[PDB]
């Protein structure tokens, strides 16, 4: 009966907890205590692109580490040239409520979405010299929050309907769907192998999906509030998520548990974006407290500050070759550190 | 600088176009609609005519009013309410047919992002309220007074006014029975007063 099912669930949870606690022979902090620290890292602003008029909600690097795309709530999605701070394109939108962006790995497509429950696709290499909407996917009920290109013919989306689905930019149909989240999904990230991807809902939990067989594998918990960002370690074996409880955490896939906690007493604001480095040594996190921090990824100690913004930072992301850093805030300014 | 001059010219031209469009598109007056399900929003939105964001724009007395409705979003309000920080006002509609509406009004009045946007208050089904009174202390067990139409309506209005905590914002009122189309005039007057106050406070003299 119901009591039997509840007892079985409790026994399964007990087995999972015991297996997770068994593997924690020693902590990462003890092992990393002997290794030398990195000292102090100082970074200075190199450029500043002033084109937008309203708040900025996304910024995605190109595949060649040269071009960038920035999406704002003014109804525009400009395309930048990092090395000379030049505008190359300008794409007006039908809806002014957009809170996502993406940039194709081959450099021929741009995707946007928002509060209208529709994911758009744009064509950059038309023969008539203009940008034309090739497709407009539909079928999601809740607001779309994130979307990434697997390749030139597929796209994965995470919407507010507590579901994630895999599309097809050729026929525009939901090929597969993923279920298991009891709250809004506000963060999605795909592995470098482009075969697995993890997502973060708004009920303090993160799960790992499989694109091929279309089902869940594992569930990680331990936060206290709604997760707002997620990313992958370059090795593809660990991921770090920063919740609204002012604490970033590091999760190991094989160990099936957490490793380190990143907390500072002076900071109480909730993280809005996280991103690793090329060698996996710096975890440059953005904060709602008008500044950015550069945590050492192994010793859990701070190593600098990217101060300079006049409002909350809503995005951050390093390049492909780990040479620059781009952050955009609600003051309508994008700054390229180095 | 062999042919980068052409790219620079293109960038300058599109920047100029962006600035021109941004300035030309900033003269509209935004608004917002909140309330319960079928609590009078339908009557007002049908009176002036014309599942995500639903937008309407009608030009009245040389002022372009844009109206939004977000009733179709069945999710937590704390995840998208910050997008509407810059609205010029907020329109709230309540019906006297029935804590359901006062709780949401108190929540929206005390929100951090809305410490300066005024709320225009509309009441609906006044004669229906009188009929229900004839057929009012159940909805207000703490009501210490006679069960008469005038006193009950006035005390409920005072309860609406009591939830305010921020002096910087003002709450108006208007009575209606979901059968009149005079709301345009009162919206116009409230909006022009709010515009004057906001501009003067921006200049710092207010």
């Amino acid at each position, epitope marked *: 009966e119901l009591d039997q099912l509840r007892q079985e669930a409790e026994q399964l949870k007990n087995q999972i907890r015991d297996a997770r606690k068994a593997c924690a022979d020693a902590t990462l902090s003890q092992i990393t205590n002997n290794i030398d620290p990195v000292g102090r890292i100082q970074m200075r602003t190199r450029r500043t692109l002033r084109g937008h008029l309203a708040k900025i909600y996304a910024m995605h690097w190109g595949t060649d580490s040269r*071009l960038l795309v920035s999406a704002s709530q003014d109804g525009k999605l400009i395309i930048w040239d990092s090395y000379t701070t030049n505008k*190359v394109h300008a794409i007006p939108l039908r809806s002014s409520w957009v809170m996502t962006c993406a940039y194709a790995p081959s450099g021929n497509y741009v995707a946007c979405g928002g509060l209208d429950n529709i994911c758009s696709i744009y064509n950059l290499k038309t023969r008539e*010299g203009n940008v034309r909407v090739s497709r407009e996917l539909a079928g999601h009920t809740g607001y779309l929050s994130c979307c990434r290109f697997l390749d030139d013919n597929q796209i994965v989306t995470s919407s507010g309907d507590t579901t994630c689905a895999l599309w097809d930019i050729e026929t525009g149909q939901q090929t597969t769907t993923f279920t298991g989240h009891t709250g809004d999904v506000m963060s999605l990230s795909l592995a470098p192998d482009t075969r697995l991807f993890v997502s973060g809902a708004c009920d303090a939990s993160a799960k790992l999906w499989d694109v091929r067989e279309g089902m869940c594998r594992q569930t990680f918990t331990g936060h206290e509030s709604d997760i707002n960002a997620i990313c992958f370690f370059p090795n593809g074996n660990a991921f770090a998520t920063g919740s609204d409880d002012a604490t970033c955490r590091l999760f190991d896939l094989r160990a099936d548990q957490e490793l380190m906690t990143y907390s500072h007493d002076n900071i109480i604001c909730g993280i809005t974006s996280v991103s690793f480095s090329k060698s996996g040594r710096l975890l440059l996190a953005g904060y709602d407290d008008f500044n950015c921090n550069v945590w050492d990824a192994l010793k859990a100690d701070r190593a600098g500050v990217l101060a300079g913004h006049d409002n909350r930072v809503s995005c951050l992301g390093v390049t492909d070759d780990g040479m620059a850093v781009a952050t955009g805030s609600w003051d309508s300014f994008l700054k390229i550190w180095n | 600088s062999a042919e980068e*001059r*052409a790219a620079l*010219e*293109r960038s300058k*031209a599109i920047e100029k176009n962006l600035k021109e469009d941004g300035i030309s598109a900033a003269k509209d007056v935004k608004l917002l609609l909140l309330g319960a399900d079928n609590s009078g929003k339908s009557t007002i939105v049908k009176q002036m005519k014309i599942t995500g964001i639903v937008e309407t724009h009608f030009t009245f007395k040389n002022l372009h009013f844009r109206l939004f409705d977000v009733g179709g979003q069945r999710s937590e309000r704390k995840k998208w309410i910050h997008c509407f920080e810059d609205v010029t006002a907020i329109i709230f509609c309540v019906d006297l047919s029935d804590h359901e509406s006062l709780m949401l009004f108190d929540s929206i009045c005390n929100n951090k992002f809305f410490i300066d946007t005024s709320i225009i208050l509309f009441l609906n089904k006044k004669d229906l309220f009188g009929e229900k009174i004839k057929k009012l202390t159940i909805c207000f067990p703490e009501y210490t007074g006679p069960n008469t139409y005038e006193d009950a309506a006035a005390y409920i209005q005072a309860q609406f006014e009591s939830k305010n905590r921020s002096p910087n914002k003002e709450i108006y009122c208007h009575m209606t029975c979901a059968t009149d189309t005079n709301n345009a005039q009162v919206i116009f007057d409230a909006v022009t007063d709010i515009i004057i106050a906001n501009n003067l406070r921006g200049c710092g003299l207010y």
Partner: single-chain antibody
Amino acid sequence: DVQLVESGGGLVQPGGSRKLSCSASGFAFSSFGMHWVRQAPEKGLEWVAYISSGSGTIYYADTVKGRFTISRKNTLFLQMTSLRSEDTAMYYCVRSIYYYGSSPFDFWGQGTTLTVSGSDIVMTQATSSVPVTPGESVSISCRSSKSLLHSNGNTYLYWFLQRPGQSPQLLIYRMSNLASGVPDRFSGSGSGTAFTLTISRLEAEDVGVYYCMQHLEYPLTFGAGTKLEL
């Protein structure tokens, strides 16, 4: 689809004047630069005029300055005055759009036959004529006066193909990239001064004449032209 039809050519007495038009349809003509290139009955290609987007910048060649004027719906003009003997040619119309990653000199018109009764980078092609049978691999070389390897790391050499009885088509732009629609058989390379294009598995349709062009700084000078005929 895309078409640049044009007309306005005919026999004109010496010292006269004539107007030519280059009608354009099928694309966004409002943001595309327009050139004008001419070709004598026997000699190779030359350069005449150019107008940018928005009429901001206009250039002219050495022998045409003052005489002709280029002016810009979806119609382009070129006023001609004081015709002389050397003016007889078949003028073409060429579009071009410039930004990071663009492909200038993409589409060519069809031509309007007209008859009348130093600091310049010089390009040389030694192989005036080359006899090659089908089924073999060929190679053509274009040399220059000044190095075309700018400090940015980009070279500004262009290679054109003009089949018999047609209009030229772009084959290789910036000395290393292949334009859209061209099969991967053609390949071009080089460094600084010596440029060489490599053609693999020559087919019958590849017969024609090949031209070499630079884009470092105006004016633009074509090569002499190599005839890789059968």
